[PDB]
Design a protein around this ligand. Sequence first.
Ligand SMILES: *CC(=O)NCC#Cc1ccccc1
Length: 223
Amino acid sequence: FNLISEKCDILSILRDHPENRIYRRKIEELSKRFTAIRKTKGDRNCFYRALGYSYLESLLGKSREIFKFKERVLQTPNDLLAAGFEEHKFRNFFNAFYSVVELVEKDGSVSSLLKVFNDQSASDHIVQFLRLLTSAFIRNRADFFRHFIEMDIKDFCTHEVEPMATECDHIQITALSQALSIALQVEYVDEMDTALNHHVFPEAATPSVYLLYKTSHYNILYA
Ligand SMILES: *CC(=O)NCC#Cc1ccccc1
């Protein structure tokens, strides 16, 4: 469980910031709305790895939702082609993502999905696929995404989306959310004496996924 941990009680993360009055206050508050947390490895890939595991976990046992999601995933090679990616360069990464979607449909267990996301090879192939699809979705809508941002859209995707270990901002979150129709809520826990607060992507949606952002790092929350 070195990439995505077991579930733990929400108050188990007090020990990560002992004798820090603001962190203690905000974690206590968070515990009133959320029961449990899973931790991710902090390797620069945590947003992609967390979003993928948590969203696919949320599908388990939901046959119409899984069918509709698989239909969208089967079309994603066209997004990549339209942005200038070549099929022989993305095939290995697309096949790894399609394989874990089929595991959600056919096996259906938490334990099998956790095993794939803790297998360094399978899990890093999955993250690289998600980074290429984020890039493609931004490139194909450059006039729409100009406004979050490298001056050039193209330079930004080359440097800050496609490479492994590159950190995210609101543009990557919004783009991957839109590319896969995943509704997500991000809770923000910083060191300033401010309200605990959150953002929903997109604004009007009922989220599937809840993440905790603290110390430039994303962990998974359970409501
Ligand atoms: C998303 C990601 O991989 N971020 C890097 C990090 C980190 C981190 C912060 C606090 C504790 C452990 C890891």
